[PDB]
């Protein structure tokens, strides 16, 4: 038998296939099972709100025409630029951006066709699909990336939308992501929309990404505790009439809000208060208050030196006064900045333990 | 009855259908409602004075052909790919930049068609239009972004664009800006457009938008009223003979002026001044007097010094001017302060509460 | 009477209506008019030397063919989708970039058909145009920006461009730019192009637009001012023998050249000095003259001490020279600044008035 | 004979030469032999994570069909816009970003066919392919970047690709690279695919790249170290009563860490630390240790002053003390410099010398 | 005549002409010469290593068809829709990216055909084209840019490309660019291509382009003279007792190696060494030494406190070292900075002279 006649007789002039009417017409809704297969996941972004994906689409359904039984063979491979002569459905996504075919050479196209009539299409497709992330908890959190298949012309009554039991999303071997790590777990579930025009059928599936803690730490944890560190017992230590004390003072201050100026590039605004946001005030909170202290000794100082010029008797008190302020100081302030760091990383932990769930 | 032979018979080459002549030719205006769906509202910026939109148009409009009247059903979906066979109106906005739509795997088109010859148009479009706004007042403000849909080449005499009584415009369940909150008012009115060629319909749709203080607060408000805090009572303790004290107010005015210039970044070129131009003008202009106060104790403790080296009693006199100047300073200025944010304050709240009316 | 079929009979196969050849052939030169109407005027940039703008362009001419006289009304609004069957001119404009057509929806073109045989052609479009600008005088200027309409294939024997007596330049109401003013003056003339293959006929719109002031005097000449005004009478003051005089001195030039580099950002790379170079090299040089004074008054001031360890008489004498200095120079400056800025600002407003002209 | 009688004869209407299906049907599969040459490449970049190739893919394959014999000559060179006619093998690439065709003024494509039935087929395109680089040694590293091709459609028992056993790879002469060394090995080797679908050939090609040192070493390894330079022997010199001794340390130790900050911006965000990190922070403690020193002598010096306030005994053995430490320092300093600087860069050299093997 | 009948008769199917096979076929190559008018040169840069050019391209071949002689005129101005019924030439360039054809209103397309059979096709493109620039010396240079036309698909026996004895480069009147200065000498020669298929034709033209000193003086050359200025006398005047003198001279390091850090922004990174390197580097040397040297008076001043706490006489000697180091050094440092200067402009001048050459 020539090939030809075949693929002409079977779906060309001579058969009565007309391409614009749905199989089972006047008739139960043709069922439509997905799978999707995902080559790579790449730049995920949060000023703009969205990321990107490059999957590969397989839909199949079932036709009562395009029945041969007269080949002996069970499945044909069939040339991909006849796709225009057939019934492919409607299929879009509704956070939709790009979404531009891959035709390199020749189309990234796939066709075949089983005795009864069973077809299998995949298609080559790269999505930027927009994320609504939140940030309440911004450098330990979860964040939920929705994709949605549906209808755009049909009603329920016609192009039923059902997902496949088996291996339903599948993820390329040995493939990572620098900033997240991707959770094996991806639920799905679908919801209907609901229009004026009609009820339209949708399939929904979910990821989960955590972000890495790794990076955040070095830029940011470690160096503002350095600053602290730096005003920790470096002037305490030096002589209360000193000019530089104060400089130092100042200059660690107005570096480290710099710094908490710098934290907040790459981020979108938002009205909420992140727990970065959170950190970098209580720090700033201990710096400014070294300087209090300072001005605080100064003070004492000053009333030291203006009754000095029972009088030696008031200036050993007010001396005094100024070794149990600063002694003081250099034992108390350790153990408050001990009491926060374990309350803020213990409440962080649980919460994300207690989200996770 | 077969479905092919309907689909040609009705509107092919054995009908007189031409798809160039407009219905009702000779006749009264081709009456037109048009229905909107606003599936993501986005991209709102400043600089490019414009932002983004995707939409669902819907518009409807009667044939006195395309009339059946054989099939027992009421309406048709038909296939999308045969809209080019039709009498499809011609419409444009005028605030047009990208436009292009969306055709992943099936043009997302929609068509439908009553007995009486009543039809549904659906396409999804994402629109980037300009809106002209006014930053009179930069942290607070109101903004009106305009649409407008519009007949390129027919007159008044052909046609007229109607709204729609009952849900003009709707909003996807569920949607969000970060930056702005979306008011549910949604006013409409129609402005015709007259040119030399001739005079065309239009009708206009206005949204009016409103801005979080939150995320202004945190980082211009707070931070500013800090370098504020910096000054007010850390170098008036300390002793008059500093150099520091001199070297900690420069420093204060340096990075204060710093951050106004950093302020404006984002925002677009403009003659007129901002509200937050003010505030930052007025805590430089408190900055600056902080050393213009220090100068002068200096130039009279410099007189008290040359003299010194009826003297005494004039020494005294000098001291004692120095110590009036200080207090009455560390008293003096948190009031005008205090005067000053519930003006400001107070003024602002109610020109929003009568520009809002 | 049909539609169709004059339509058909009109324009089509059984018209001896070539397409491909100009009317009036082997005669005179066709003549067109053009009209230019302008709907948003927008994007000035300096570093890429172009605007944005978007137009309607209309051209009309006449044809001896296309004269029906059989229909009693005098004019015909035909549909834009048979704009391919009829001889369009070729125009092209010099300086394209971009330049797309839009077509949303349905493409926007305009048909329309006088008895005699006037035909008018309508095409929106959005231009992207190079201006080649010169920043002569940077905050004060006037800039003349260049539109070219030329006729790329055929010479002077064919296609000679008119303007239109009436009307040819007409712009959207409430138009307005954020950054540049637009004249109403509009003066047109037309220039010819020579080239080896021959010479081609070509029309010139010229555009004037003033830059605003506002601006540039708040984000540069008040600050620079204010650094200035911070050293003018806020070190002379102090005490003689003081570390942090020379500091605010030391700090003042450097953040007011960091400005200066600031300053120079968005501009593109010129060989040629702007004026803003020139205030800001002045108020450098004032605030370097600050230090070398400082410099001045500490060496004889050195000298003074040096024979200090008929003596008393020259240390009289030095200090005597030392108060003279200063004094002499906080009266000297003042003037002279204020005979700079009544110069500079009295120049730059009669050269723009000379150049207006 | 006349061309156009041999052109349709052979590939045309009177043919049975279907394109739609392979040679040597329902039979061995199809090889394919590929050869490539690289015009330029270019274009690596660490934050995208991709590269930019300019390449001239070239594939033959044989044809029991479209053998003449029967004009006198071996080979003919035919028209390339007749490659529609003919069975192209489908191609495409894992990595697939951009990727569009050539076509300035004619469509870059190329034809032979030869008297037995070997074809040629050449195609010009610019691909945009994602390299996975570890960045586990910033400074020194070398990254291998893969270049993948498969057939998409068609299983293992048909197009099976061979790769060319003589210049299989080939590069234009006199082509460089500004940031990186291209290193002339290109191992060949293929690794095939499977899916559900079914298994699938692909072919591998690999580049191996070395950067350059020079830049770095200019930019970041000499300031910081000059820094370094600015604080081993420039405050140690100076007098232990200064003010402006510990203000020289903060200033160095600050202006450091914002260089430190610097360094990271082209950089992706990563987890795990590079050398470039290490070296940055062994430097920033030095400078933090300096600061430490200081603190130490001063606290010294302290308990020195209180006491002076047996005693002389105990006042020189103080001063004593601050000598030792001063000087040991002096001389303690530089050896633990040599010792790391010579452990860091051996370890580095030969970590890229048994890792290039 | 009527003009339809000849042009269907001359080039239709009526005629033998097939449009895939080259004049002259079996025959000697088709000689091609080649005039480019160039209408716009912009956007040179470093980073990316491309320039953009918009130009005229033209080539005219003879054809022994289209010979009609029939009527009275000696050339024919076609219409340019029919140009894809001739045999246009393949022809493409090397370094291609971008190379988008402009098609506003009309393709901007020229046909003429003499009566011998020479024809004229005149194209407008835009390309952007790759200049592999060396940086040897970057403020100071020569920049040679290549353009290549070749022929991909045909090889030496056919089409080979010539230059135009006359006007083979034109320039419009009244072009110029902002940084760079084009030289009026166009150097035209001719490199063939080899290949494992086949040898092809090639033609080259090069463009030699100097840079403008001028911004380069004003941005780096004299602010960095400035800072070095701010050096020369300003803290050897000052007393040598003084911790400021010590602050101005570690300020002036600071900001002027921030200067060395920002000079190297739009630059590609290179490992060789650039002119302007040179000179920042030495400055940096000499702003270095200055505190060196106030080491050094620093060290010799505190031997001499210590041992002044035959002593008044060594005393004596250790002041008198000092006053000798100072005054040696302040008219030691001009002479070799003036050495230096000369020495580096007369060799750059008369680097830049032999290179020309
Ligand atoms: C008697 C007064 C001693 C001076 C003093 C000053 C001072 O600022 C603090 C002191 C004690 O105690 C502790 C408990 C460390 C406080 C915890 C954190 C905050 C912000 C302030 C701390
Ligand atoms: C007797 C003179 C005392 C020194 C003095 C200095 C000074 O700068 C001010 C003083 C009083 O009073 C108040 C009312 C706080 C003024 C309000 C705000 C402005 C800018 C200046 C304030
Ligand atoms: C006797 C010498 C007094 C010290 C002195 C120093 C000085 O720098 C200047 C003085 C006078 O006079 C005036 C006229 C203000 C000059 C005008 C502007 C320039 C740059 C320098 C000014
Ligand atoms: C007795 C104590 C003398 C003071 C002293 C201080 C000091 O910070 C160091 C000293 C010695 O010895 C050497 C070996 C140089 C250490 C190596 C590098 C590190 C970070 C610390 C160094
Ligand atoms: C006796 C020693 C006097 C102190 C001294 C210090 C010094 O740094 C230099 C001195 C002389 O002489 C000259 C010739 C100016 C040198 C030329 C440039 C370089 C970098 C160093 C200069
Ligand atoms: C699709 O599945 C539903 C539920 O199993 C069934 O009722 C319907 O008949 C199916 N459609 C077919 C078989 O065309
Ligand atoms: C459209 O509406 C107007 C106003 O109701 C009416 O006058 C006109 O006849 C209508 N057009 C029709 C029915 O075609
Ligand atoms: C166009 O105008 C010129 C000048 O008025 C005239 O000479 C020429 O005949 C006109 N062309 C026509 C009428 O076709
Ligand atoms: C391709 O090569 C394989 C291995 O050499 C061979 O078995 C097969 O027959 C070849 N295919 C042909 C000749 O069509
Ligand atoms: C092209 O020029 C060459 C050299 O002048 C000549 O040999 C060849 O015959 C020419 N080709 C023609 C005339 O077709």
């Not at 995902?38 to 972004?45: E, H, K, M, R, Y």
């Not at 397989?58 to 225009?84: F, G, H, I, K, T």
């Amino acid at each position: 038998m020539p090939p030809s006649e075949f693929l002409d007789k079977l779906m060309g002039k001579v058969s009565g296939y007309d391409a614009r009417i749905r199989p089972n017409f006047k008739g139960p809704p043709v069922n439509v099972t997905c799978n999707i297969f995902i080559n790579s996941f790449g730049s995920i972004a949060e000023t703009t709100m969205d990321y990107r994906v490059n999957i590969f689409l397989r839909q199949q359904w079932n036709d009562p025409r395009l029945a041969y039984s007269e080949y002996p063979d069970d499945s044909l491979d069939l040339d991909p630029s006849m796709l225009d002569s057939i019934w492919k459905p409607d299929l879009f996504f509704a956070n939709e951006k790009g979404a531009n075919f891959h035709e390199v050479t020749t189309d990234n196209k796939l066709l075949r066709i089983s005795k009864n009539g069973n077809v299998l299409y995949s298609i080559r497709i790269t999505l930027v699909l927009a994320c609504p992330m939140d940030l309440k908890n911004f450098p330990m959190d979860v964040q939920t990336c929705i994709m949605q298949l549906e209808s755009f012309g049909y009603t329920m009554n016609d192009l039923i939308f059902e997902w496949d039991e088996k291996g339903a999303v599948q993820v390329a071997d040995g493939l990572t992501l620098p900033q997240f790590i991707l959770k094996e777990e991806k639920d799905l579930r679908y919801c209907t929309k609901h229009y004026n025009t009609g009820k339209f059928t949708c399939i929904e599936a979910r990821f989960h990404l955590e972000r890495q803690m790794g990076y955040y730490l070095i830029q940011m944890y470690i160096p503002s505790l350095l600053i602290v560190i730096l005003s920790w017992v470096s002037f305490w230590i030096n002589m209360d009439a000193a000019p530089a004390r104060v400089g130092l003072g100042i200059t660690t201050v107005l570096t480290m809000t710099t710094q908490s100026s710098g934290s907040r590039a790459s981020l979108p605004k938002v009205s909420y208060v992140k727990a970065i946001d959170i950190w970098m005030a209580v720090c700033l909170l201990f710096v400014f208050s070294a300087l209090l202290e300072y001005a605080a000794v100064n003070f004492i100082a000053r009333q030291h030196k203006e009754l000095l010029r029972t009088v030696e008797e008031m200036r050993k008190l007010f001396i005094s006064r100024a070794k149990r302020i600063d002694t003081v100081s250099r034992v108390a302030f350790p153990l408050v900045f001990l009491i926060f760091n374990i309350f803020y990383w213990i409440t962080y932990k649980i919460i994300r333990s207690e989200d996770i769930h």
